[PDB]
Amino acid sequence: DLNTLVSELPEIYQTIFGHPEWDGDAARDCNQRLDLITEQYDNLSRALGRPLNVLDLGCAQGFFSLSLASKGATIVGIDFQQENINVCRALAEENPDFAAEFRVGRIEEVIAALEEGEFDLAIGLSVFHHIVHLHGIDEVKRLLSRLADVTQAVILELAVKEEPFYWGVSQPDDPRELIEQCAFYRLIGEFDTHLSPVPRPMYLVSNHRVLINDFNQPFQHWQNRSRRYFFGEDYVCKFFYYDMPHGILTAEESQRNKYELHNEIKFLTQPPAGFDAPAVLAHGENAQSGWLVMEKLPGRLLSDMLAAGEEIDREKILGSLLRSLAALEKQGFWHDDVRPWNVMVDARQHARLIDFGSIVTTSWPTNLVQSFFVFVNELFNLPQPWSNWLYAVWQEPVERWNFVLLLALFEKKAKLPSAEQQRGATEQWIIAQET
Amino acid sequence: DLNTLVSELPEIYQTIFGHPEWDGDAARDCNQRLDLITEQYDNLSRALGRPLNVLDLGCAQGFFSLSLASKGATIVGIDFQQENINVCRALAEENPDFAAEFRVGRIEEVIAALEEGEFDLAIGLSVFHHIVHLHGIDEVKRLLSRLADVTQAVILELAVKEEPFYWGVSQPDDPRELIEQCAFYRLIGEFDTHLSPVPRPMYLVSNHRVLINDFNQPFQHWQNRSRRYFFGEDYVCKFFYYDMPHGILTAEESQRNKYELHNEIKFLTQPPAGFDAPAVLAHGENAQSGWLVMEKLPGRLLSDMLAAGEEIDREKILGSLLRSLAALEKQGFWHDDVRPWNVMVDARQHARLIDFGSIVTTSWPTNLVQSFFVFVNELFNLPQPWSNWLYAVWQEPVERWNFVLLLALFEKKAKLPSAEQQRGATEQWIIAQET
């Protein structure tokens, strides 16, 4: 009988599915977490085009398991207390069409035994802090990595050290230390536990997909540490953290990240005429982070080609870059931050800027022209006619320095007088000194 | 200069690729391991239809890395000694067309950072016992799982506790404890280390593919513990361990496994006329283990349907089973071991045997007829006309008991006299008592 199985629960942690006579007794009503979890279930189910297999770790009285089985999910619920599992099976028996199984088992053993592809979605709500408390942080991170490795998505609600209880003392400094080794993660909500005023963050995590409410796609590789890049078949997703764990970002740096991304979004959604910019496939910002999905460009980053000493055509790289810098300038745009790590080189040795967070609209623009000289020097130090080019620019009154001029003198550099035949000289040492 | 970089190696562990003037100095010549590794490289490359990305953990002086890059592999070699990496890069520079990178790093960090799909093949030869010695066995198993999770194949040479040195004392009882949580593994050789007379086993391991020299295919799930089953799109691979770790198998049990598989192979490659048997796609046996790849049958195992109390038609299950048992018997074959875990039931409620290791060719066959009664009882205890069927058989002189008779009385059971109208009686209690 259910009355008996319920009374024997050491704790009525969750709502008893379909049995509201216990809602007043449940530690946690579960409706807020459920609303968020069903939404993420729908997203991933829509993306995969089918009902999902769901794993529920530390599933307690089965509420999220049954509730998802109710929407047509196939669920396995795991808990290490026999009493919790007894209630789960009795509830599944009241719902014989739900495809729902429950097992007494330890989460550590189950994760060691999972096979990639068995489950699309795993949920682990308020369970891992127990494992943290007994096995430590490193083991939990490896468990969580493997859980992300073998599913499409993981949803975690994580207890935090700010909670007032003795076990809080064993928690990482920040719940993100448990998951930051995973590829993709995004805070999706914050929940009241009824134990204290400190809420628990809920995270959506994946080692296989970009899971953004608007764009749900596998990626095949990813790279960095408060910016992440996910590479899919024809996209790059640029993911910025504003809110970072630990001392990582200063107020200042969070705000630059935010500003740079907002700015990249604004530039790319309304590019200037005369400039070829990557198409924007999706974008969004929230308190913790912001993201931008773009069409993916071919080639390698210039910094890589220089580090991994691969062969480069500096004429073609400089000319193509300068041509775009001049086109930009004609429309009243400039790039603050022209560096080898911001430039991509395609197979035909043509270059383009890739980080548009540093695009600005307002002795301008002499400072930028100046650092471009440095850029040129790092790119190589200067042989003729490159040195002749720089020397001609140095002879210009300063109010004439701009990118149209830089480009025009670059295109005629073979006809310009020989710098080493003049005094000359100076400008050599100035640029060399910044570098 | 290479002479210098070599002299600074704390140890010339491997042959210096392309530099035989040091072969006399190398701790290990590497040619035996290399021959085996190139063969496995070729197999997997042939199966994937392309050159492989290879990860070499604790790559020392780069010998296996360079040797594979030489066959067109893209390789990354990792070692935590700067001196080893210095030599690796100098050797790669003598071979500028090899696609080869080397990094100073710790194996633990690198594996935490791997992404599924980056590397097809990882090799870890004589390196993990160092990590065992510092971090313990559980951490090493999780590292090895993740390494299998993110590649197609892993090749490991593992030090063993029988080696005479002090660190042997920290090793697992059996090197297989490091990998047995991985899905697929197969001993492919045994190597002399020149430290002692104890050789080191080399294992081929995968969490994604069945890697058998003749059959190299992804599988999508697997199941058990000295027999493993891998399920691919249209195959089941049945993998038997003869040689198990620890006390697991007795001499007796290894020999039964061997005999049962050999026997399954012999039956299936020459089935009797009149019996529909699964087609054999590949097979092989060696000292440690044996394997059989078969076409995959649809349905569920009868034991599962009974445990997970799913609905069954006992008429159709019994008749179809009996019909095959009678056909078998007509050709002079019997099955020793007719149990619910050896029977599969398709969607039309038709049943077939699946474990043919218990097929025999020689008061026969009364004992088998007897246990079939038990089978029938477990399947259900007997209502009429099932009980009437058994009662008729019990009335037969014993020399007449066989499967043709069992089938013939089963088909007429609705016409047979009512058992409960006779004495009757006995046979009820006999069968009930074995069960």
Ligand SMILES: C[S@@+](CC[C@H](N)C(=O)[O-])C[C@H]1O[C@@H](n2cnc3c(N)ncnc32)[C@H](O)[C@@H]1O
């Ligand atoms: C705080 S409750 C959370 C229950 C449920 N996940 C929820 O949030 O609604 C933690 C649950 O995990 C179970 N549990 C704790 N550690 C476990 C482990 N190592 N393996 C399996 N279950 C565990 C407990 O039995 C308890 O039901």
Ligand SMILES: C[S@@+](CC[C@H](N)C(=O)[O-])C[C@H]1O[C@@H](n2cnc3c(N)ncnc32)[C@H](O)[C@@H]1O
């Ligand atoms: C015994 S040697 C084996 C070398 C090579 N794998 C072979 O079998 O030919 C072990 C190698 O692993 C390196 N090594 C040991 N522990 C390591 C770790 N934790 N991370 C990276 N390299 C390590 C050592 O520098 C040494 O080169």
Ligand SMILES: O=c1cc(N2CCOCC2)oc2c(-c3ccccc3)cccc12
């Ligand atoms: O469109 C892009 C294509 C790439 N390439 C595509 C092939 O993989 C190498 C990187 O990278 C981009 C990056 C980037 C970020 C980190 C490292 C390298 C590149 C930033 C913004 C846009 C792109």
Ligand SMILES: O=c1cc(N2CCOCC2)oc2c(-c3ccccc3)cccc12
């Ligand atoms: O052809 C076969 C199909 C199956 N089925 C196919 C679908 O997955 C469930 C098992 O299983 C087989 C097994 C088996 C082994 C362990 C568990 C269950 C079945 C043994 C021998 C042959 C088959």
Ligand SMILES: [Cl-]
């Ligand atoms: Cl938690």
Ligand SMILES: [Cl-]
């Ligand atoms: Cl080892």
